[PDB]
A = this chain, B = another copy of it.
Amino acid sequence: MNYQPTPEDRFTFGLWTVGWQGRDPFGDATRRALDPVESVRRLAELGAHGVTFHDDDLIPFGSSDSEREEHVKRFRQALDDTGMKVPMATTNLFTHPVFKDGGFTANDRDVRRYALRKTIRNIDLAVELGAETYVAWGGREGAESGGAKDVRDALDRMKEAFDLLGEYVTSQGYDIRFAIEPKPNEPRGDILLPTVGHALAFIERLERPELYGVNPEVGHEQMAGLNFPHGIAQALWAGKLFHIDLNGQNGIKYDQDLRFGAGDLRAAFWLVDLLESAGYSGPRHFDFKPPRTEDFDGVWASAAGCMRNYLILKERAAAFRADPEVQEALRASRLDELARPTAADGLQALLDDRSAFEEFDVDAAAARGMAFERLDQLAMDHLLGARG
């Protein structure tokens, strides 16, 4: 009937999301800045579980150690007052002009050293605040032109950076894991580690791969026209889905950061189905921007709608999977056979099995329908709640 979030639903929001002032490449801010304390409060009242932050969202850049301390304690007090948690944190290595060519892979060596020190400083803070995941979105790592960046050297520098962060964390005894967030472009012409697959592959080259996973974002993979639930299944299959950023995107264009549920709705349905089915237990984090058309009432409406749409899709996906008619259609489409080993009998028995080749009736096989269209219309009926 209705769909109210509880903190048990693990919904979390970045300070920068509801706090986005509405500045875009062609326009000035349309909303005033939000005090972090005020956001914690408002989010708590909406049913959220926690918030996340960039170092610079919380502690304004160039802050004295003194001012730093005051900012953290007011924040901490808001968290104690509301019961809100801080499950993830990250570093802003993209806004300040010093990062115009990147942080960890900037051509200037002194900038790469500064980016590491800025990062290390905020990992200590995140650990204090209790975060369990440290996200890294290398927004400025990339190029607008081919000669500007040797990508093998840049990958060496990127691995060097993450390996040093891993050494730091292990030597401190910290219980925190890293999650690399890929994005194919924007604000660089091309960004390094453009998709979930590139980040997964990169991780396997690190000195301690087990400390690193991915933080995929709905809109990022869709900016490359990729199927996000598929990319998430691959990350789940690799054991690397450490966090996830949820939002909406209408296709291949600039990253819109629409509220979750907006953009590609069927994709959202299949994503919720997979997360709930796979038992994903991390935060459901919304990395989104209330449109600049909105005032603050529209900001909290947008934030509420993220949660609402997740909870509606979860109910429709559970209804779909629990429907006996759907379970029969799944067997009719042979999903059960997909889950069985192709050749548990082993290579030699396969080579020896004439039914697998010499005597296989390929024409009868080809004639069998997969029945996928009836299955997909049942999924559609369930999503629309039209199961007459």
**Do B108 and A334 have beta carbons less than 8 Å apart?**
yes
B293 to A22, Cβ gap below 8 A? no
Docked complex: A253-300 residues within 8 A CB-CB of B? 253-256, 258-259, 261-262, 264-266, 269-270, 273, 278, 290-299
- Contact flag A253-B238 (CB < 8 Å), given A25-B23, A114-B357, A385-B385: no
Residue pair A253, B254 in contact (C-beta under 8 Å): yes
Residues of B within 8 A of A270 (CB): 146-147
Known A-B contacts A94-B27, A370-B101; the reply to A376 vs B294 at CB < 8 A is no
Q: Does A335 contact B (CB under 8 A)?
A: yes
User: Which 3 residue pairs spanning A and B have beta carbons closest together?
Assistant: A295-B369, A197-B198, A197-B197
A144 with B347, Cβ < 8 A, contacts A95-B26, A205-B238 known = no
Is A122 positioned at the interface, with any CB of B under 8 Å from its CB? no
A342 close to B (CB within 8 Å) = yes
Task: State how many angstroms separate the Cβ of A113 from the closest Cβ of chain B.
Answer: 4
Contacts of A375 in B (CB 8 A): 145, 147-148
- Using A294-B373, A341-B160, A342-B112 as known contacts, say yes or no to A199 and B197 having CB atoms under 8 A apart: yes
Q: How many residues of chain A get a CB closer than 8 Å to chain B's CBs?
A: 169
Mask: chain A, 106-124; 1 = CB below 8 Å from B; 0 = not: 0111111110111011000
Determine if A253 and B186 form an interchain contact, defined as CB atoms under 8 angstroms apart.
yes
Please, how many angstroms separate the alpha-carbon atoms of A3 and B338 in the complex? 33
Q: How far is the CA of A108 from the CA of B118 in the complex (A)?
A: 46
Tell me if A150 is interfacial: C-beta within 8 Å of chain B: yes
| Known A153-B339, A362-B98: A148·B370 in contact at CB below 8 Å | yes
- In the bound complex, do residue B254 and residue A384 qualify as a contact, i.e. CB atoms below 8 Å apart? no
Interfacial chain B residues near A26, Cβ < 8 Å = 94-95, 139-140, 186-187
Check A17 for interface membership: any CB of B closer than 8 A: no
Check B154–A338 contact: CB distance below 8 A: yes
Which chain B positions have C-beta within 8 A of A161?
Answer: 342
Given A25-B187, A152-B233, A265-B265, 20 further pairs, Cβ under 8 A:
A28-B96, A100-B370, A112-B342, A114-B362, A145-B373, A146-B376, A147-B378, A148-B370, A151-B233, A152-B278, A160-B341, A164-B347, A190-B250, A194-B197, A194-B230, A201-B234, A224-B226, A291-B373, A301-B374, A305-B376
